[PDB]
Write a protein that binds this ligand. Structure first.
Ligand SMILES: CCNC(=O)Nc1cn(-c2ccccn2)c2cc(-c3cccnc3)cnc12
Ligand SMILES: [Mg+2]
Length: 192
């Protein structure tokens, strides 16, 4: 019943996306970023993370990284599925992404899963080792949903990242634009 209730949730989000993110215009596209960054901010307010990085990659992929505990990977009681899977299959940003990847650094291990329109493409896998902890999410907004534009505006992202760092003192938040490999722009904010 749990996996079924996942699938229906994905269908609900993709059918009426503006009811979930306000709009499917440029404002809604940027809201994707905010939803991811807010969870990293919670991890910092919980006392675990202090660095967040937002990268505009080639072809308008977004990469968000935090140095928190890593979204958990233990098998759930209620879903029979890894915890990270449960959280990402319940995610609006994942449902509204043509593709999304997660890498978790936790338990000295790197775990990876990829999704399309919220649907896992394979079971969570151990891909490497690490001596760090944290979460990386990389997603590509679905152009079937975001029919006006899938191009992010650096200044929009910059303004709000600066605000978030000034509000959440102590967290280092970095924005980087790598869309033109010949001219990479970075702003990094860290108050008090
Ligand atoms: C790059 C975007 N990064 C994230 O989304 N980071 C997190 C979201 N979540 C999260 C968890 C639940 C619901 C929604 N989001 C977390 C939970 C934990 C966590 C909690 C308890 C023990 N160990 C780790 C740690 N990082 C996260
Ligand atoms: Mg949220």
């Amino acid at each position: 019943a749990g996996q079924i209730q996942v699938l229906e949730g994905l269908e609900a989000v993709r059918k009426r996306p503006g009811m979930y993110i306000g709009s499917t215009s440029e404002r809604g596209l940027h809201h994707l970023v905010w939803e991811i960054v807010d969870n990293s901010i919670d991890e910092a307010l919980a006392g675990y993370a202090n660095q967040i990085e937002v990268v505009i990659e080639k072809d308008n992929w977004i990469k968000v990284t935090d140095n928190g505990r890593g979204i958990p990977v233990d098998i759930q009681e209620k879903m029979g599925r890894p915890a990270v899977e449960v959280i990402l299959t319940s995610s609006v940003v994942n449902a509204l992404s043509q593709d999304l990847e997660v890498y978790v650094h936790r338990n000295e291990t790197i775990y990876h899963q990829a999704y399309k329109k919220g649907v896992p493409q394979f079971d969570l896998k151990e891909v490497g080792t690490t001596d760090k902890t944290g979460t990386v999410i990389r997603f590509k907004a679905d152009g079937e949903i975001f029919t006006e534009t899938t191009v992010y505006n650096y200044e929009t992202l910059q303004q709000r990242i600066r605000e978030l760092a000034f509000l959440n003192k102590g967290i280092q938040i970095t924005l980087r634009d790598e869309r033109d490999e010949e001219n990479v722009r970075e702003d990094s904010y860290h108050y008090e």
